[PDB]
Amino acid sequence: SADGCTDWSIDIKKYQVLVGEPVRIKCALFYGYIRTNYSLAQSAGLSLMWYKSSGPGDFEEPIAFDGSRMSKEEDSIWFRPTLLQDSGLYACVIRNSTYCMKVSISLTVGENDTGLCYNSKMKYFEKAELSKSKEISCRDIEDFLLPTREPEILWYKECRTKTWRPSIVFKRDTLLIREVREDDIGNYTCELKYGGFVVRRTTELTVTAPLTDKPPKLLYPMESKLTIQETQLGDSANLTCRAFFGYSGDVSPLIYWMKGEKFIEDLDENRVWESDIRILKEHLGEQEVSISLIVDSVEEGDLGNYSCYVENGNGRRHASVLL
Amino acid sequence: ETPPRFTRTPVDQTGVSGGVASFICQATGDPRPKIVWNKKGKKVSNQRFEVIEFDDGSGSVLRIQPLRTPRDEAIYECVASNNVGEISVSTRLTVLREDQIPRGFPTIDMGPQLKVVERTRTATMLCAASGNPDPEITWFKDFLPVDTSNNNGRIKQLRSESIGGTPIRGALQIEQSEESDQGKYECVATNSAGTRYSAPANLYVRELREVRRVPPRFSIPPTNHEIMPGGSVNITCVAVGSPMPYVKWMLGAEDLTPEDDMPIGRNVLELNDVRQSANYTCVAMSTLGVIEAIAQIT
Ligand SMILES: *[C@@H]1O[C@H](CO)[C@@H](O[C@@H]2O[C@H](CO)[C@@H](O[C@@H]3O[C@H](CO)[C@@H](O)[C@H](O[C@H]4O[C@H](CO)[C@@H](O)[C@H](O)[C@@H]4O)[C@@H]3O)[C@H](O)[C@H]2NC(C)=O)[C@H](O)[C@H]1NC(C)=O
Ligand SMILES: *[C@@H]1O[C@H](CO)[C@@H](O[C@@H]2O[C@H](CO)[C@@H](O)[C@H](O)[C@H]2NC(C)=O)[C@H](O)[C@H]1NC(C)=O
Ligand SMILES: *[C@@H]1O[C@H](CO)[C@@H](O[C@@H]2O[C@H](CO)[C@@H](O)[C@H](O)[C@H]2NC(C)=O)[C@H](O)[C@H]1NC(C)=O
Ligand SMILES: *[C@@H]1O[C@H](CO)[C@@H](O[C@@H]2O[C@H](CO)[C@@H](O)[C@H](O)[C@H]2NC(C)=O)[C@H](O)[C@H]1NC(C)=O
Numbered sequence: 118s119a120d121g122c123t124d125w126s127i128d129i130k131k132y133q134v135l136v137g138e139p140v141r142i143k144c145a146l147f148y149g150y151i152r153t154n155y156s157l158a159q160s161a162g163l164s165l166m167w168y169k170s171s172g173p174g175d176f177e178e179p180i181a182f183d184g185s186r187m188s189k190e191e192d193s194i195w196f197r198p199t200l201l202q203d204s205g206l207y208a209c210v211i212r213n214s215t216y217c218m219k220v221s222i223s224l225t226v227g228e229n230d231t232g233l234c235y236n237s238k239m240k241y242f243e244k245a246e247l248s249k250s251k252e253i254s255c256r257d258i259e260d261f262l263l264p265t266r267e268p269e270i271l272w273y274k275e276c277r278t279k280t281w282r283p284s285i286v287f288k289r290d291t292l293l294i295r296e297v298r299e300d301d302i303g304n305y306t307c308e309l310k311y312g313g314f315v316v317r318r319t320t321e322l323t324v325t326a327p328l329t330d331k332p333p334k335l336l337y338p339m340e341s342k343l344t345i346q347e348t349q350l351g352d353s354a355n356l357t358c359r360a361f362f363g364y365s366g367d368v369s370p371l372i373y374w375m376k377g378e379k380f381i382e383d384l385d386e387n388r389v390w391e392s393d394i395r396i397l398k399e400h401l402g403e404q405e406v407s408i409s410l411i412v413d414s415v416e417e418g419d420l421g422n423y424s425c426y427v428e429n430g431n432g433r434r435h436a437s438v439l440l
Numbered sequence: 441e442t443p444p445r446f447t448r449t450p451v452d453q454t455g456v457s458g459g460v461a462s463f464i465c466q467a468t469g470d471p472r473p474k475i476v477w478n479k480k481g482k483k484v485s486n487q488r489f490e491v492i493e494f495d496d497g498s499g500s501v502l503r504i505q506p507l508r509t510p511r512d513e514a515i516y517e518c519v520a521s522n523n524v525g526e527i528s529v530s531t532r533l534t535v536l537r538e539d540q541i542p543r544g545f546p547t548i549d550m551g552p553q554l555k556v557v558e559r560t561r562t563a564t565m566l567c568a569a570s571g572n573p574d575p576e577i578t579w580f581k582d583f584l585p586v587d588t589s590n591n592n593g594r595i596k597q598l599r600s601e602s603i604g605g606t607p608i609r610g611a612l613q614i615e616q617s618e619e620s621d622q623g624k625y626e627c628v629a630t631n632s633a634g635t636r637y638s639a640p641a642n643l644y645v646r647e648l649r650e651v652r653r654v655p656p657r658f659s660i661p662p663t664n665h666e667i668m669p670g671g672s673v674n675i676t677c678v679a680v681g682s683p684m685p686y687v688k689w690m691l692g693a694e695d696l697t698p699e700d701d702m703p704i705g706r707n708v709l710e711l712n713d714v715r716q717s718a719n720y721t722c723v724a725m726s727t728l729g730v731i732e733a734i735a736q737i738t
């Protein structure tokens with residue numbers, strides 16, 4: 118519109134680099150919001166302007182490029198090298214007399230944490246399973262890669278040079294582990310030299326047990342046996358259900374209670390209710406969890422078989438107690 | 441007096457545990473019909489189920505705030521009851537196993553974030569989602585779906601126009617923001633495989649504030665000069681504003697100043713070896729507006 122631009126608040130992609138690193142940020146409009154070449158909006162008579170604000174709510178101001186450190190090239194801005202002052206929001210705006218559209222690109226430049234080779238706030242995160250293969254790649258270095266040239270990338274584990282076992286391949290820009298171990302948890306720093314400036318990418322690897330081919334395990338109440346618990350009508354009654362869950366995906370476990378057939382949602386009122394899935398223990402992505410059913414004030418109709426159900430993709434198990 | 445007539449019918453859908461599930465059912469009639477929701481043939485009554493009626497009075501929405509999958513994986517019935525007749529419709533609600541999800545299930549790449557906006561100023565919420573069949577973005581405001589049948593009014597919907605291989609972006613833009621727009625805002629990504637909900641985001645509308653931004657205006661417009669073929673001339677064009685505008689020189693429909701070094705506020709066209717009459721125009725553009733003023737050389 119002529120009076121007001123069509124603001125696309127900020128873009129999903131964030132640029133976060135250590136200071137002293139070359140980086141190129143490009144207009145998100147052409148790459149996600151509208152279908153057009155940059156040089157194709159220019160031909161149609163649309164102009165491309167950049168603004169910069171220090172914060173999300175702060176005021177936007179024009180930019181004047183010098184061409185050497187901050188150069189404006191095509192639909193992108195080049196920082197060679199970045200400075201701490203370069204952080205903020207860079208608004209890409211395309212407009213003509215009647216049309217206007219803009220989006221904000223976030224750019225954060227920081228120092229690495231004390232004694233480390235990375236900034237904990239700016240890290241990639243990847244998951245891997247034991248006994249299986251995992252490939253970690255040095256991400257977001259397209260502009261630094263020549264297909265005819267080997268990047269001569271160095272890999273560090275915990276910011277230190279280590280001796281890598283032959284089971285780890287190290288081909289071009291990727292590290293491949295053929296069989297993952299719990300020993301393999303850690304921070305992987307990838308370091309590449311480009312034009313006299315060192316660029317780095319750091320990935321934190323989380324390791325879990327393999328995906329379970331087994332159903333959950335019912336600890337209490339024990340299946341194939343009927344445990345009895347009966348109480349007075351005046352006092353409260355608490356029934357806990359303990360189950361073990363192998364790694365079936367990082368997800369909330371399916372453990373629930375059932376009275377004969379009802380789901381403890383029909384006549385509950387304030388009287389019966391579930392325990393809210395407390396998580397007792399976990400390691401390598403395997404969780405030992407418990408959910409209790411509580412009858413706060415006992416009645417004659419509450420008495421009966423209560424069955425805990427536990428389920429994953431491999432199967433389910435039910436066991437019941439009696440009041 | 442008329443029997444109930446369905447104007448909006450609920451559609452079967454597949455959610456995820458911990459997600460939410462919303463069914464819409466609108467009916468018109470005189471007198472206004474009353475809508476009732478039945479789960480497995482049973483009228484719903486639960487803390488987890490919230491029935492929110494439109495301010496139209498005609499229609500209602502059934503909201504399952506937490507999904508448990510075995511429980512509430514069922515067939516639901518919307519029954520519009522009139523003084524003169526009853527009509528009913530049915531739908532299927534599948535709450536998918538949070539462990540197993542199809543590869544192309546819609547996922548929220550980025551939801552809407554809480555926003556605070558001045559009165560009478562446009563507030564825009566963004567949503568980015570993706571799936572193997574590229575999803576469709578809808579919006580729910582305070583548990584009720586936001587309707588923009590067409591872009592008749594202030595609450596317009598913005599759709600990304602990607603060519604593929606990118607997340608899809610849908611935006612809810614509120615022009616001329618009334619006081620009554622604040623509250624919970626949820627972006628829903630709908631797909632043939634299933635539907636997923638974004639985390640809620642509160643919109644807060646607050647106090648009117650001072651006019652920080654002023655559109656661009658010419659401080660020194662370009663002056664006409666009449667130098668004859670021998671001479672050379674410098675023409676100054678200065679525009680100001682908040683923010684300061686970019687100022688470029690154009691001859692007809694050709695750009696004379698380069699796109700990489702476009703100056704801020706003040707541009708001086710230097711003309712040497714001029715010989716013929718020209719109609720040069722100074723264009724000062726900003727995010728607020730674009731203006732142009734012409735200097736003639738004879
Ligand atoms: C992120 O953290 C890392 C810390 O590991 C940091 O980069 C590292 O340390 C320094 C940075 O200054 C660099 O290592 C250099 O190695 C060369 C040889 O390759 C040496 O010549 C350098 O030593 C000079 O400085 C000494 C200081 O007293 C002098 O005594 C000496 O004579 C030399 O003049 C220097 O140590 C390199 O960048 C890495 N090195 C390794 C091993 O990782 C980095 O600077 C941090 N990031 C930011 C943005 O600060
Ligand atoms: C400003 O740019 C817009 C977008 O490129 C132009 O709008 C298009 O104009 C023609 C016909 O109006 C068609 O290509 C599209 O239907 C229009 N798209 C939109 C979104 O309006 C507009 O014509 C340009 N204006 C000038 C003066 O160049
Ligand atoms: C990988 O790096 C992170 C920091 O980026 C390390 O996390 C720290 O670990 C210990 C205790 O867990 C403390 O120093 C801090 O509480 C943690 N910081 C953060 C930000 O989590 C982590 O230990 C490193 N991994 C390995 C294997 O050394
Ligand atoms: C009901 O009793 C059970 C068993 O004592 C409680 O479960 C334990 O709660 C304590 C205190 O929160 C924790 O330290 C334990 O780890 C819990 N055990 C398990 C296996 O969950 C439960 O909290 C009680 N619930 C109520 C509110 O009565």
Ligand SMILES: *[C@@H]1O[C@H](CO)[C@@H](O)[C@H](O[C@@H]2O[C@@H](C)[C@@H](O)[C@@H](O)[C@@H]2O)[C@H]1NC(C)=O
Pocket residue numbers: 672673674710
């Ligand atoms: C246009 O601007 C340039 C740069 O500011 C000036 O150098 C021009 O004026 C100069 O005047 C003569 C006396 C001589 O020094 C020569 O270098 C320039 O022509 C100026 N031209 C105008 C105002 O016509």
Ligand SMILES: *[C@@H]1O[C@H](CO)[C@@H](O)[C@H](O)[C@H]1NC(C)=O
Pocket residue numbers: 154157
């Ligand atoms: C985008 O630009 C290329 C040239 O760089 C051109 O060949 C192509 O046709 C353009 N895409 C269109 C017009 O869709």
Ligand SMILES: *[C@@H]1O[C@H](CO)[C@@H](O)[C@H](O)[C@H]1NC(C)=O
Pocket residue numbers: 717718719736
């Ligand atoms: C300049 O513009 C005016 C009005 O558009 C026109 O009448 C005049 O002929 C133009 N002069 C030249 C030299 O193009």
Ligand SMILES: [Zn+2]
Pocket residue numbers: 299400401
């Ligand atoms: Zn261990």
Ligand SMILES: [Zn+2]
Pocket residue numbers: 300
């Ligand atoms: Zn060990």
Ligand SMILES: [Zn+2]
Pocket residue numbers: 435
């Ligand atoms: Zn059974």
